[PDB]
Amino acid sequence: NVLVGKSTVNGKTYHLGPQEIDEIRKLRLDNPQKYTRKFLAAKYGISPLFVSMVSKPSEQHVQIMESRLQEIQSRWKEKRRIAREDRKRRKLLWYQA
RNA sequence: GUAGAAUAAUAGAUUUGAAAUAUUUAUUAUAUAGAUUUAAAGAGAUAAUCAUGGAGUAUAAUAAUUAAAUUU
Numbered sequence: 001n002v003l004v005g006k007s008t009v010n011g012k013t014y015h016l017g018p019q020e021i022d023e024i025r026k027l028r029l030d031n032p033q034k035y036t037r038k039f040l041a042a043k044y045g046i047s048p049l050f051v052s053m054v055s056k057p058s059e060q061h062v063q064i065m066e067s068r069l070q071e072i073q074s075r076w077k078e079k080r081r082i083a084r085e086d087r088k089r090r091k092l093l094w095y096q097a
Numbered sequence: 098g099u100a101g102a103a104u105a106a107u108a109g110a111u112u113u114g115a116a117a118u119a120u121u122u123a124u125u126a127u128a129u130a131g132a133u134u135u136a137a138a139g140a141g142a143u144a145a146u147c148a149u150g151g152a153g154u155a156u157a158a159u160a161a162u163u164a165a166a167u168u169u
C-alpha cells in the first residue's frame with residue numbers, strides 16, 4: 001500500500017456524535033493554537049481532515065497563517081521561487097493523462 | 098438613448114453529500130541518504146543599427162530654336 005490513509009487500512013468509523021462535534025467546533029472557535037487539528041484528532045480518535053471538514057477556525061487565525069505564508073514566500077531567493085513554479089507546473093501536467 | 102429576453106463570468110442567500118485512497122489532497126520547514134542541474138569574463142553563427150568605403154546606377158551647358166508626340 002502506497003500513500004494510503006489510516007482509514008483505508010482499518011475501516012472508517014462513525015462513532016462521534018453531534019454533541020461531541022459541537023464541542024469540537026466550539027474548541028476550534030476558541031483557541032486554535034492550543035486546540036489544533038492534530039490535538040483534536042488525538043482526543044477523539046478521528047482524522048484531522050474530518051475535524052477540518054467539521055469546523056472552521058477563527059478567521060483571524062487564518063489571516064495570521066496567510067500572512068506568515070506570504071512572509072515565508074518573500075523570504076525566498078529567486079531560484080527557489082522558479083523551482084516552486086516549475087513544481088506546480090509539473091503537478092498540473094501530471095493530472096492530464 | 099430606454100425596456101425586455103438567451104448565454105457567460107463574479108458575489109450573495111438557501112439547500113447539498115461526506116468521518117471523504119489527509120500515516121500528504123493542497124503547501125512549509127529542517128535534518129540523513131543518494132542523484133543531478135544551473136554560468137557568460139569573453140566568444141561563434143544569424144540578423145539588425147550606426148559607420149567606413151565608393152563599386153554600381155543615373156546624368157554630361159540644360160539653355161534657346163527647329164519638327165513630332167502627349168495632356169490644358
Ligand SMILES: [Mg+2]
Pocket residue numbers: none
Ligand atoms: Mg545563457
